[PDB]
Design a protein around this ligand. Structure first.
Ligand code: ZN
Lengths: 70, 82, 212, 92, 84, 170, 77, 73, 72, 75
RNA sequence: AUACACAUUUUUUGGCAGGACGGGAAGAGGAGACGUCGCGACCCUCGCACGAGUCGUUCUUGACUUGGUCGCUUGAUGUUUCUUCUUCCCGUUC
């Protein structure tokens, strides 16, 4: 997971919503802080710019490498 | 403690937005954040999944119930880049 | 010219570039087909052996050759064996082989290629024998045989292919069956180390920095 | 001492079903939370009811545009999480 | 490296203004600025450019260009951009 | 000279300002997925090594004659075509969700040459033709509106129902 | 202004009939007397009754050990 | 104090039935044993779904987590 | 003992993980965390139409079951 | 185990919203490490419109794990 | 550089249940709330700095405080209740 740091990553939430943002830090619970994170729902349609977010590890399903870091 | 917990403690005194497991959104000034993610919030504007919006003075939600928070970008500078 | 050519995208690890053919998967599907568990990997291979014979797979079928599940399975398996065959022998003209088999199918197989001194002439499509060649010929125009040859053509042909391709691969079939028995008679540590070996062979450069 | 007491409690407790399953190599059927069922032999288990199962046959129930049909498949080497377990039945 | 533009139709939303500005000024060189910091519109946009020659070329070539109904006025910024 | 994959691999690749993502194209010349600027691109080709991760394509300052030879790119939203010599447009462009096209300062002469832009389904919201000879021809604006009503903003001016109706009247 | 465990303890002593609201279930709620509890809030409840709200009926269950996880809201009636 | 653990120990070796949170399944059988985390082992078990007998399961294990309550029968 | 260690042994193994949400995963285990968080490469993934992904990390609690090779 | 800093809320009337879209109102009595709460003068607000005084003085207990959130009616 | 992570806030869970297509328009027998971000403008407003504002020391850092409104003249979107045909044009496929 440490390798994934600073990358643009795609997390899938527990509710099916897809979040995309830079991975700044993690923790034990897999709580993630995502910089410049935006939300996509259906697939672009229904995209919103959230900004800096924490996500809770209890909600996270999976993560995948989206793009390289800024 | 978690590094994100440390950030969230830095977020105190700022305006944050919270989405809970129900889906309601609470925007307002975060008074206090415990290690367990329990948060005390002020002057909250709430938007329900139906779209209805309410105002409330003081709100305190359990950590476990929070889906996610958005905090201001001021904090993004440091010291979590390390 | 072929710098982006990769065998691992053509062969699975259990096939070891043509050393073995992975039939465990088909053993699974087979269990699903027979609707039980009385069938072991080795008993399944024992079943496959039928298709090395020119008559067994026809006159001593594992299941009734008009069963759906069975015919579907046989299709999938046949396809696998064929692709494996040409996959493991790139250098031989695929089209040549294909046409050879097809012509053998048309000129002999469907022409009473299976003959018995007692029962006469067997027909793959109707699964019946015939006294003499005469009644056999006048049966190849009958509404029955028309129906069958018109419905079960693809299956019959696929069966046949499974037959001849498995014959051409007898050495690989035996090699694998052997492998099965070996792994089966291993211990835990043994089986583990062996798997390690197959893996290494799979993810190793085709040319070592230390070759002559 | 503590380890001993843990293994013993495990032995005479409800776990005795899955312990018995591994030692006898007997088939057991597992009702899961996915509304799928797994009949198999117990290769290994865990305090969380994490399991390694062999000769797996999972049965399930599917609805279509007509009568409900049961569907089933064979998975020879199956590892299973411990929270999916609703119930583990041991039977002749 | 940064150019100060003003006299623009403020009726355009922020994100569309920024996307059209980046679009228009990409012809001279890479625009480094992602977003208008000033968040007040009324023309007052700053465009940051990686090389200086692209800033000068944009300034001379796009003076008084009709952009969303209005001829834009372009000048060099008083101070250096934080990102530079 | 040619846009080839060897070039595709190693240009200044980064994220747009707009946070639009991409991976750029410069072994010695013309680029893609970011800054396709100033390396004398004659004909677009070999977009496949772009392999889809790109929101934007800054083609400006090349010698492009026409816009064909676009592999299927789902991700590409913005094309910055400025300062080329685009005479014609392909037609079967249809890269779904191409929202923005920048034709500024090119050489598209005829109204009819603009026809292929109608194919862009409902995504081509922003199109800028300013700097072309076709702009001078009579009823240019109205013909673009009647031809591609999908455009929401033309030449950085917004469509408006008034000239939509005038475009209907003629 | 008393901890909930002491509240439950006074339910224990008073032997009052108790109504529990379960988790994520509005349809049914359980009722009966608290004869004992543990640290996990599992409760032995005597003369317990299932009360479907959907006039109300119910099923007499007798003695019950109810797991504390279901517990949403413990009350007195 | 009479704790759930002693009540349950006294309930061992007795005919019981257990209603799960789902209520989709109840199990009636002899209570063989229960552990400190309260997983349940029953014998001769019978499954009652929607209050009707589904079938006779026999020696059965119940994950603690699924248990809504247990009652003696 | 701890089966999670048995998963730790499973690096470079090709597996099909069914998940509690019903999702199917297919890929080579690069590592599994003790949380049973599984990192895989060369993964085809089917949500309940397959998406092909270079690397996928999964939170362990979401994993329903993992189907291992029979050769193991 | 941490204790929730609920002292500021003590002896205040609060609207608790709870799982299952349930909502109750009552004066915050006690709490514990577990976030379990004692509420006096508890009143259930059913989904319809009426409200029932469940625990006027007898007081109720709400498991903290079920407590979605808590609003302060007073200041 | 070299024991533990199943009993309330995180990972051992309250979860489960010629033919077709796709637009856009017309003619006949989808429509109400409640929100949240956009095309235009008769409007507001009028400017270089922001994250902003001040100071100590030195050629660059450390401390301390704290688009909004109206239309859409058929813009885009998630609750949540209730009850299709025909014709013409433009794209894909065979
Ligand atoms: Zn015949």
């Amino acid at each position: 997971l440490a390798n994934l740091i600073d990358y643009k990553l795609r997390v899938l939430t527990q509710d099916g919503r897809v979040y995309i943002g830079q991975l700044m830090a993690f923790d034990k619970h897999m709580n993630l802080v995502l910089n410049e994170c935006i939300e996509e729902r259906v697939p672009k349609v229904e995209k919103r710019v959230l900004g800096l977010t924490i996500l809770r590890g209890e909600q996270i399903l999976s993560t995948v490498v989206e793009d390289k870091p800024l | 403690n978690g590094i994100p917990v440390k950030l969230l403690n830095e977020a105190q005194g700022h305006i944050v937005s919270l989405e809970l497991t129900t889906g309601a959104t609470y925007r307002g000034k975060l008074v206090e954040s415990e290690d367990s993610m329990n948060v005390q919030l002020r002057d909250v504007i709430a938007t329900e999944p139906q779209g209805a919006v309410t105002h409330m003075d003081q709100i305190f939600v359990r950590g476990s119930q929070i889906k996610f928070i958005v905090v201001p970008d001021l904090l993004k500078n440091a010291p979590l880049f390390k | 010219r072929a710098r982006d050519l990769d065998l691992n995208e053509i062969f699975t690890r259990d096939e070891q570039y043509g050393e073995y053919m992975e039939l465990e998967q088909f053993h699974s599907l087979w269990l699903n087909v027979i609707k039980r568990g009385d069938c072991s990997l080795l008993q399944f291979l024992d079943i496959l052996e039928l298709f090395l014979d020119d008559e067994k797979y026809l006159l001593t079928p594992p299941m009734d050759r008009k069963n759906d599940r069975y015919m579907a399975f046989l299709l999938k398996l046949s396809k696998y064996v064929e692709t494996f065959f040409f996959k493991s022998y790139a250098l031989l003209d695929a089209a040549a082989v294909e046409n050879l088999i097809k012509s053998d199918f048309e000129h002999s197989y469907c022409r009473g290629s299976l003959r018995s001194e007692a029962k006469g002439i067997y027909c793959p499509f109707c699964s019946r024998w015939f006294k003499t060649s005469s009644v056999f010929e006048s049966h190849l125009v009958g509404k029955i045989h028309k129906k069958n040859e018109s419905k079960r053509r693809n299956f019959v042909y696929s069966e046949y292919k499974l037959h001849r391709y498995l014959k051409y691969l007898n050495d690989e079939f035996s090699r694998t069956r052997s492998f099965v028995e070996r792994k089966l008679a291993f211990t835990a540590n043994e089986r583990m180390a062996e798997m390690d070996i197959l893996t290494q062979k799979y993810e190793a450069p085709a040319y070592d920095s230390t070759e002559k | 001492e503590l380890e001993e007491l843990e293994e013993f409690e495990f032995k005479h407790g409800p776990m005795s079903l899955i312990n018995d399953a591994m030692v006898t190599r007997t088939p057991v059927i597992i009702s899961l939370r996915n509304n799928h069922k797994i009949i198999a032999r117990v290769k290994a288990f865990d305090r969380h009811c994490n399991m390694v199962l062999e000769n797996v046959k999972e049965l399930w129930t599917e609805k279509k545009g007509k009568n409900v049909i049961n569907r089933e498949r064979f998975i020879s080497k199956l590892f299973l999480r411990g929270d999916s377990v609703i119930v583990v039945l041991k039977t002749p | 490296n940064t150019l100060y533009v003003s006299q623009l139709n403020e009726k355009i939303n922020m994100q569309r203004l920024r996307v059209n500005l980046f679009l228009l000024f990409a012809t001279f060189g890479e625009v480094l600025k992602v977003s208008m910091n000033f968040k007040k519109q009324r023309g007052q946009a700053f465009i940051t450019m990686r090389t200086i020659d692209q800033a000068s070329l944009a300034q001379i070539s796009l003076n008084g260009e009709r952009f969303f109904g209005k001829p834009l006025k372009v000048e060099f910024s008083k101070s250096e951009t934080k990102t530079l | 000279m040619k846009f080839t994959p060897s070039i595709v691999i190693d240009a200044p690749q980064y994220y747009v300002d707009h946070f639009n993502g991409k991976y750029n194209v410069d072994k010695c010349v013309i680029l893609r997925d970011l800054q396709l600027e100033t390396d004398s691109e004659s004909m677009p080709s070999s977009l496949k090594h772009l392999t889809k991760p790109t929101h934007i394509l800054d083609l400006t300052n090349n010698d492009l004659i026409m816009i064909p030879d676009l592999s299927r790119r789902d991700d590409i939203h913005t094309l910055l075509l400025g300062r080329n010599n685009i005479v014609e447009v392909d037609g079967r462009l249809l890269p779904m969700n191409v929202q923005n096209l920048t034709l500024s300062n090119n050489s598209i002469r005829r109204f009819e040459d603009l026809q292929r832009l109608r194919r862009a389904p409902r995504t081509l919201k922003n199109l800028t033709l300013i700097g072309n000879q076709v702009c001078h021809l009579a009823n240019y604006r109205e013909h673009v509106l009647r031809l591609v009503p999908h455009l929401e903003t033309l030449d950085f001016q917004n469509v408006t129902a008034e000239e939509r109706k005038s475009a209907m009247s003629f | 202004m008393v901890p909930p465990i002491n509240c439950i303890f006074n339910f224990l002593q008073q032997q009052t009939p108790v109504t529990i609201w379960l988790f994520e279930q509005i349809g049914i709620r359980i009722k009966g007397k608290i004869v004992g509890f543990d640290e996990f809030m599992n409760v032995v409840i005597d003369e317990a009754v299932e009360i479907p709200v959907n006039v109300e009926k119910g099923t007499p269950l007798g003695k019950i050990l109810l797991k504390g996880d279901n517990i949403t809201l413990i009350t007195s009636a | 104090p009479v704790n759930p653990k002693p009540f349950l120990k006294g309930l061992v070796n007795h005919r019981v039935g257990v209603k799960l949170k789902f209520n989709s399944t109840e199990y009636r059988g002899t209570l063989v044993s229960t552990d400190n985390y309260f997983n349940l082992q029953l014998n001769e078990a019978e499954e009652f779904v929607a209050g009707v007998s589904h079938g006779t399961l026999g020696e059965i294990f119940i994950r603690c987590n699924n248990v809504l309550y247990i009652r003696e029968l | 003992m701890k089966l999670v260690n048995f998963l730790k042994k499973l690096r470079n193994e090709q597996v099909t993980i069914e998940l509690k949400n019903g999702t199917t995963v297919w890929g080579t285990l690069q590592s599994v965390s003790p949380q049973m968080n599984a990192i895989l490469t060369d993964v085809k993934l089917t949500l309940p139409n397959i998406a092909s992904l270079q690397y996928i990390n999964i939170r362990g609690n979401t994993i329903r079951q993992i189907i291992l090779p029979d050769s193991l | 185990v941490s204790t929730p800093e609920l002292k500021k809320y003590m002896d205040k009337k609060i609207l608790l919203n709870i799982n299952g879209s349930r909502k109750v109102a009552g004066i915050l009595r006690g709490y514990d490490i577990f976030l379990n709460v004692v509420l006096d003068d508890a009143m259930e607000i059913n989904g319809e419109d009426p409200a029932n005084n469940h625990q006027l003085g007898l007081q109720t207990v709400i498991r903290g794990n079920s407590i979605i959130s808590l609003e302060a009616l007073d200041a």
